[PDB]
Amino acid sequence: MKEYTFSPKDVPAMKQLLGSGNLQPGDAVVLKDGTYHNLKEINFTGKGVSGKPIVWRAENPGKAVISGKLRLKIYGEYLQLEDLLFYKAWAIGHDMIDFQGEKGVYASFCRMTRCVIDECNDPQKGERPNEGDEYWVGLRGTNNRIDHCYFANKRVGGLVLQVWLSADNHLNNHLIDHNFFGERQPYGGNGAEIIRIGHSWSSQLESRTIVEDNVFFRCSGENEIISVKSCHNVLRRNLFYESAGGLVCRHGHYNVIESNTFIGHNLRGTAGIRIINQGHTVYDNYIKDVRSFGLLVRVGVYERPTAETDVKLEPLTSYHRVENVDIAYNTFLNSSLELGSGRGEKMPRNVRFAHNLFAGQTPDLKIVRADEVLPGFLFLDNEWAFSDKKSLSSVSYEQVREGFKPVDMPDGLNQEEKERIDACIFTVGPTWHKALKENVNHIDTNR
Ligand SMILES: [Ca+2]
């Protein structure tokens, strides 16, 4: 096993070695302290093996800085980037860092860990809608991992992290864990998501991406923090803090949403979970002080397509009926329930809303097209805890009244929140980046 060391004056030789395919398992490409400007088109390829990846890393964590024009493609097996700081770099074209070489030649078992992407905005792209688009990280292939990274201050349109699916490469089992997705200011239009899993056109395909133990801090570009657009993904134990958007099951089916926590601080645009499409299981989520919606269950325009469906007549970009969704053991604290809104004639069917706590000061419960929507819900053994003890009796729908029991405000909620936040923030991100430590300390001291 060999270490190959380079300095900023050696960018040409560095790019050649990384892109040659000649690196062997256990080898490392090591960058001495400095700023590496304008790498431009750079490939990282090779074949590591399990337990012996090929590594591209800083000699001293955080002191190798990559800036300027960049088009990095990663493809091969068991390749790892570690401890790199991407600062004021930007994409030559659409994609700054991509896990594919030529179309069809993918990364697998590759990993980006303890890296930062901060302020990586093309000066020649604009900050307003339609003034330019660039994506920071594109996942392709299978079994790749993004972990313990910090991504913040994207100011141009486009995704922080896109999971790309195709008809012949969709089932990925990628893992996105222990990352800190920091501030994103309002974009003023669509296309400023943090994570997008698939696309409308790939949304009927199984992805099996796992998004676990991540922090989203002031992610406020648009109404979707995470836009789930594919099937069988798992979103677990994430923290959404002061973020002006929601976790949205936008397209695709059978997504599993477990034990996430939302701390909105009553800020503009903060939201919880938005449900479109079928088959999801939504368990143990805790949604607090969000102002747009706590839970939204939408009508659909079309049924889920079959092989016979002409998707030119029933587009995948539309909205598909909610059916067969289990919503159990969640908490909605000073956060609304909005059931049956949206355009379309496909009412929700077979939605179970059971064992949830709906609590706060004044309840915010919105039911649309009640006599057509409520038959599609089973409300069972929920708890209702609000200041006015007459409030449940004032609800117009007996089926709703019978599905809730009034209770006094439970006394363990502050401790429950502390456990959830403590579990998410003290193992997140790269420890060497001061802004990660500062932002984590902010959450810790402003719960
Ligand atoms: Ca969007």
Author numbering: 21 to 467
Per the authors:
BcelPL6 crystallized from 0.2 m calcium acetate, 0.1 m Tris-HCl, pH 7.0, 20% PEG 3000 in the space group P21, and the structure was solved at 1.3 Å resolution with two molecules in the asymmetric unit. Both PISA analysis and SEC indicated that BcelPL6 is a monomer in solution. The 10-“step” asparagine ladder in BcelPL6 is the longest reported to date and spans almost the entire length of the β-helix (10 of 12 turns). The visor cap is kept in place by a hydrogen bond from Gly-423 to an asparagine ladder that creates an extensive hydrogen bond network on the hydrophobic side of T2 loops leading to their distinct shape. Electron density indicated Ca2+ and two acetate molecules near the putative catalytic lysine and arginine residues in BcelPL6. The Ca2+ is assumed to neutralize the C6 carboxylate group at subsite +1, thus facilitating substrate binding and lowering the pKa of the C5 departing proton in the lyase reaction. The carboxylic acid group of DP4M at subsite −1 aligns with acetate shown in the native BcelPL6 structure and interacts with His-219 at subsite −1, whereas C5 carboxyl groups at subsites +2 and −2 interacted with the 98% conserved Arg-294 and Arg-216, respectively. BcelPL6 has a rather flat and open active site; in AlyGC the C-terminal dimerization domain partly covers the active site forming a cleft, and in AlyF, loops form a closed active site over the nonreducing end of the bound DP4G. The high preference of BcelPL6 for polyM matches with the monomeric structure and its flat active site, as M-specific enzymes apply a syn-mechanism that requires both of the catalytic functions to be on the same side of the sugar ring. The 95% conserved His-271 situated between subsites +1 and −1 appears critical for activity as BcelPL6 H271N was inactive, although it retained the Tm of BcelPL6 WT.
